[PDB]
Amino acid sequence: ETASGYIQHHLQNLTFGRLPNGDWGFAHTAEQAKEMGFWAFHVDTLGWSVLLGVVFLFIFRLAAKKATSGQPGGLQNFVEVMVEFVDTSVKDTFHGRNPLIAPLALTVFVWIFLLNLIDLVPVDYLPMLAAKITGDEHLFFRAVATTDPNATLGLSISVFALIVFYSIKVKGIGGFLGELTLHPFSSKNIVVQILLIPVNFLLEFVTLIAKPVSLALRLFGNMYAGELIFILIAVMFGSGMFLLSALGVALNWAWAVFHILIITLQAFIFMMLTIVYLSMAHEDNH
Amino acid sequence: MNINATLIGQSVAFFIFVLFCMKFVWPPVIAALQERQKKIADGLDAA
């Protein structure tokens, strides 16, 4: 098997969608997967994301259900540390009393961290394990959910929907459209302000739209580049040469040691940006 | 690359997880922390 085929296989997702003969079946080739329209699902991404979210929620439910209100145990001390950190972060950014912001920030941070963490495992372990368990050698399986633009886009779109919902809730459709078309530049007379509404819309709508796109792409680019560089280094081992493999080990170790920082930092940035975006939807910044 | 309905499944899972955390995780831990702080304050006001 060639290195190019190795990379091409590693770059493909497990897709379930509408075959020409019915709305049931898994794609066996990249072309067949791309033939499926918008109504298809990446099974590996959704499965891993739901599994990791369920694991995190179960672990945090175990400590919360038996809160001692005294000397904390080993697990609930860690849970309290995380909750205190999230609460301190929320208090320094958001001055309202919305109960949704803090649990949302905690969920976002821990979920994204857990999704990024599985990139540190060797690239060939989980796909080969899945191939052996299912018995199919040519099985598409990608573990890291955050390297799929669909997951990051879903997170960013849900955050954007929350932004719009809370802005409308706290300002009426009236104040929402007013802030979108009239606020940054205002005039005492009607004729000037009418000429100003296109400028205000052009300045506000672009910045409003750019938020979910940046939120998704900042995470996606970092995770995708990290996984792709991890895949490329594995090819150096595949050459079988002594010299090339020795350098590959050092490169992989350095990349992982650098990548743990990126894994933590991207989740922290996503949490902070979500908090900031939700806080500026309850106030007026222009 | 390939935009799919995974974009919808991820948002559904996200909302479900956030609604779980809002009701069954955060309040008990916050209440325990506040009760411990109240106990410490009362012990410091015993004078």
Next chain:
Amino acid sequence: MNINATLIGQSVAFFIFVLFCMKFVWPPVIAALQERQKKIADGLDAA
């Protein structure tokens, strides 16, 4: 070549990374958590 070499290289690199982590990253986190627990215990004893 190819398979059975990539696996060996990945396993060696991952083992080195795991050793590095278990020798440098874990003990500070464990120490910090235990320090938090000890401070909470001291506060409760004072109360």
Next chain:
Amino acid sequence: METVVGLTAIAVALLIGLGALGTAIGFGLLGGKFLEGAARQPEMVPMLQVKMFIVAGLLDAVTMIGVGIALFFTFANPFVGQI
């Protein structure tokens, strides 16, 4: 059609590279002044951080449009098909 696709590749490369250069320089300039402000008056840090995060939404607005249209060109090339 070969020339169209070849020049579309260069167009995507420019669209993303220029935006990346601009955002890197702009964020360096913004972060440096943020650090200086946090060092001069350490008590202002949270307000400075939230203001910096607000300005970051203006800093990369056009860059996000450029990256989006570059991604549109790569996988859904509109110029191909216009003869």
Next chain:
Amino acid sequence: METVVGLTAIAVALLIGLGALGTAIGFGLLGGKFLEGAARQPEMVPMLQVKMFIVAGLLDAVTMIGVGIALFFTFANPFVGQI
């Protein structure tokens, strides 16, 4: 013809990329000075923000025209009609 649309793709890439680079650098400078002013005098932030938006409009003035022209070229190419 293929050459006209191939050069139109490069033209769109230039139009969006140069504007993105310019806006990113200009907003980095403006936001850095705004953060410095906010750190020096926290009481003046409400009016500094208004003036920052006043000058941000002038920042984005020409780049908005550029991106509009780029979109008009991508979806309504006026150069193909000229033959």
Next chain:
Amino acid sequence: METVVGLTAIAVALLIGLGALGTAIGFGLLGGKFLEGAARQPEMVPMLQVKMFIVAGLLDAVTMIGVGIALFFTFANPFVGQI
């Protein structure tokens, strides 16, 4: 002709893009120093604003000429008649 119109597209792209880049950077430089001056003495702000406008006119004097020439090239191409 194909090549002349294809090069006119690049000409329009350069005319608008370079002006947008220069305008954004120069206006960021001007706005930063305007915010600093307004923070220094809030009571003189209207004079600073009008003096900023009278120099913004000079800043955009050549960029508006460039965008006008580009718009003239786009819809009333004078080079296709010189063949």
Next chain:
Amino acid sequence: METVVGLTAIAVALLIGLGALGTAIGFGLLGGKFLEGAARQPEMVPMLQVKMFIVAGLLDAVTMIGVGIALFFTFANPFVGQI
């Protein structure tokens, strides 16, 4: 003379765009210091404005001849007279 006219379009685009970029950067740099000086003491604004105009006369010297010859290239092309 297809190539000659096609390259003359690019020459005009460069002549105007580079001058516009340069003037925008230079006038941003000059206006920033003018506003800083006006803010430091407003009693000297009338003299500072005259000095700024004197400097602006030097700053814009080459760009105006550049746009002049760009217009001289667009109308009454001198290079098509050379075959």
Next chain:
Amino acid sequence: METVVGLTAIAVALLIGLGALGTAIGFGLLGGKFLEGAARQPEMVPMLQVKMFIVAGLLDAVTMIGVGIALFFTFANPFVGQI
């Protein structure tokens, strides 16, 4: 097809080089201001370092997108598949 591959090579080169240049300059600015802040207030060094990492998280986004897309373009090719 040879033109497509040849231009894809240059696209990758630009996409990585521009990002590297921007990242290096931005990190130079950010690190210099961080060193100045650390020198002024030695007690605030760890908070300044954490804030520098937070800013670096924003600085390095579009460059990493470009790097990923370039690495995708080298070992895979969405442009060759369009013939």
Next chain:
Amino acid sequence: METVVGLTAIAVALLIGLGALGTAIGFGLLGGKFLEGAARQPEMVPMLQVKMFIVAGLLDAVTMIGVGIALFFTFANPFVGQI
């Protein structure tokens, strides 16, 4: 010789555009420093103006050389005579 003419137009466009850009930026810097000095010490303006002119001559020497060369190429093209 259709290629030599037109490439000479591009050459003169570069010769004038680069000089204009550099002259505008350099005079922006020099005038900004001169305005700062005048605004801080109004009594020193008469000497600072003469020193600014002395610096300006050296600043504009090479740009004037380039402008002369560009005019010579425009009206008395020597490359044509070289076949």
Next chain:
Amino acid sequence: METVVGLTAIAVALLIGLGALGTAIGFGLLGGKFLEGAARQPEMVPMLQVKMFIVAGLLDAVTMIGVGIALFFTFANPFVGQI
């Protein structure tokens, strides 16, 4: 085939040259600020040196990737195989 190799040579040159330029400018800025801090606080030099090395680790992150890719292109060649 010749075009592909000729363009990959230019791609390698672009990668290494842009990386070198960015690294040199960024390290000039960082070193200037480090020397300023060392002159300001001579007793803090050992800690400032470690902080400078930490920043330098981030500054060269993408440049080393570009250099590695350029060496891979100049010794091996993924584009020639694609024909």
Next chain:
Amino acid sequence: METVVGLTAIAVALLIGLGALGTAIGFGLLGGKFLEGAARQPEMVPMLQVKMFIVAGLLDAVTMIGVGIALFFTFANPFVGQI
């Protein structure tokens, strides 16, 4: 022979234009600090002017070599002889 002559004309344009741009920016940077120093220490102006001329000798060292080489190319073109 047309290609060689055209490319040597472009070479002369680059050779003079880049030197002019660099010289103008460098002399603006030098003159700003010279004016600041002259305003700070009026009694040391005679020494500062000599030091500025000494620095100016180094600033224009390579620019004059480039200008001389450009003149040698345009009047005594050595590339026509296939060297």
Next chain:
Amino acid sequence: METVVGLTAIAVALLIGLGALGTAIGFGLLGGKFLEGAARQPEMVPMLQVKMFIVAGLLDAVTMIGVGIALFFTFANPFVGQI
């Protein structure tokens, strides 16, 4: 094969020119702060010189790699044997 060698020459020119530009600007930035520190703290110059040399070691690495690669291209061209 003329294309391969002709593009190798331009590749070498870029490799050396970009590195030279970067090193010159970076060393100007570094030496400016070195001279400032030497003038303000004349007793610390021997330490500042050693620190400047340490920084210059990091500043010039990638440029040395580039110039070595350029020499390798000029005297041991590897691209010729790939066709």
Next chain:
Amino acid sequence: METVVGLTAIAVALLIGLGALGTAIGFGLLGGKFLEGAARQPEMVPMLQVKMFIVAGLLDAVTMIGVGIALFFTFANPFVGQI
């Protein structure tokens, strides 16, 4: 021989240029701080001049290498000998 010599002319131009550019900008940056230091403490000038020359050697090393290689490409040609 047409293409290789034509591109060698461009290579010589790009070697002498960007080197003149970097040298001019770097020497402006260095001389500005040299004059600032000589105007702050007028008695440290003899030491500052020697330190400035020491920095200038490092500043001009790579530019001199590029100029030498450009002269080698002008009055000799390693590329023509490769057919």
